Design a protein around this ligand. Sequence first.
Ligand SMILES: Nc1nc2c(ncn2[C@@H]2O[C@H](COP(=O)(O)OP(=O)(O)OP(=O)(O)O)[C@@H](O)[C@H]2O)c(=O)[nH]1
Ligand SMILES: [Mg+2]
Lengths: 67, 428
Amino acid sequence: KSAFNFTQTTPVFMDSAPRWPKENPTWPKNMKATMGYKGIQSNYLPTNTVTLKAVEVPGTTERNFNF
Amino acid sequence: MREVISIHIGQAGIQVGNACWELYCLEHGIQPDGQMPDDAFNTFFSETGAGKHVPRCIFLDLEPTVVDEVRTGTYRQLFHPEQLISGKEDAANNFARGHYTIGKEIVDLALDRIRKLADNCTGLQGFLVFNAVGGGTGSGLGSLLLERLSVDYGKKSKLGFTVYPSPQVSTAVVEPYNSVLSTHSLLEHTDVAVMLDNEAIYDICRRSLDIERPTYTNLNRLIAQVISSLTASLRFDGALNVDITEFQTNLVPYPRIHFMLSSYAPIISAEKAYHEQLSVAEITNAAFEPASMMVKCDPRHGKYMACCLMYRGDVVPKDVNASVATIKTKRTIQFVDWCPTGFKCGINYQPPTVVPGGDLAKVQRAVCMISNSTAIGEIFSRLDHKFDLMYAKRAFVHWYVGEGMEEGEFSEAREDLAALEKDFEEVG
Ligand SMILES: Nc1nc2c(ncn2[C@@H]2O[C@H](COP(=O)(O)OP(=O)(O)OP(=O)(O)O)[C@@H](O)[C@H]2O)c(=O)[nH]1
Ligand SMILES: [Mg+2]
């Protein structure tokens, strides 16, 4: 394992400077991306907003999608 | 090219022929004298060599006393004088006479018309049978005529709009019998059979129309509003143009079950429109309302196998799919499990036309629903009671047996009804 200079034995003499594809306080970490889910699933088109219900009747499926 | 043949049999057959053909003449600007001041009319008419637009229909009956009214009415320059077929003696509310004695001697004439009525036809959608079950001419001739149509074309589709005997309203006493005999002959021969009762359409004229002196001329002004809505796609542009074959594929699950219900909405007086908006949302809740049925059946005792909705007017599909979606969730409406779907929807941009002197109101949104349900066994079991109540004494039989019939034709046509009601229970 010579010609390799392993990390477990590299005195602080040897040390590396991190380069761009890596986070560091000097260069800016530009924006990232995530997936935002469909919305609240329903039987009509999924929506983000919750609405009132006329027929409450615990455990029943009644809506007025058409407004 | 998108054309149909409209047959009218019996009295109520031609009684609705006067309402339907007063609509198409008015819906296309066709004057009563044939001519008007394509394919917008080719569904129902045939431009001759010059100007004239004759209809493609046939008025068939045995009593001249009504077909001659058409000959003297304002629509006498309209029809080809041979289409208005008539006879000398009548069926006399006796299924045998309309089937065995008198039926056999004019069908050979009527059939020649159809052959000469189909040659000009290049692409025939399907026959259209306006029938009134309960009379000798309606039940006998209709039965004898349908069998002749099956063996000639077979591949063409027959749609049966048959007025059915109501529970309470009954303009006859022997109408149970000939209503039973009709089944064994219509069932195997019609492709699909719509039903409607003179009683259910009476109450529609009470709550909605608020007309207190209803008459046969009033109700027929409602049926014409159905067929106008039913065949709008055949002659008027619109999103989701629905032909007949498409309409028929996704409604009839089994070759037996082709007895379906109808509805219409909105049905309102020309003044209560001032108290409503009649949105696409509001109408489709009323089409599935039990009081808006054209038959005295209760869909809440059964289940739905399919529905078909033909909207009309200022309607966009984004609101159709929304109002249909809030109905599958409603608890009252039960759909049989083997169809999670069940709606074929049709839209047109041509709003329903209104006739001067009618009772409906000029609107921009209208719905006609046609549902295949398993609750239809109700109206079909009442007949199985009155027939078995009177036939226990052989009452009125000596009329049927005296006209070239027998006693087997009663018990035979009786089992066919039991054979049918099981089919409306195997689907449970
Ligand atoms: N909706 C509606 N039903 C009608 C009308 N006229 C008669 N009916 C019903 O049709 C049934 C009788 O049918 P008809 O056509 O009059 O008798 P038919 O079939 O010609 O047989 P015959 O009387 O022997 O000539 C009755 O129950 C009527 O209630 C009508 O104008 N509109
Ligand atoms: Mg009659």
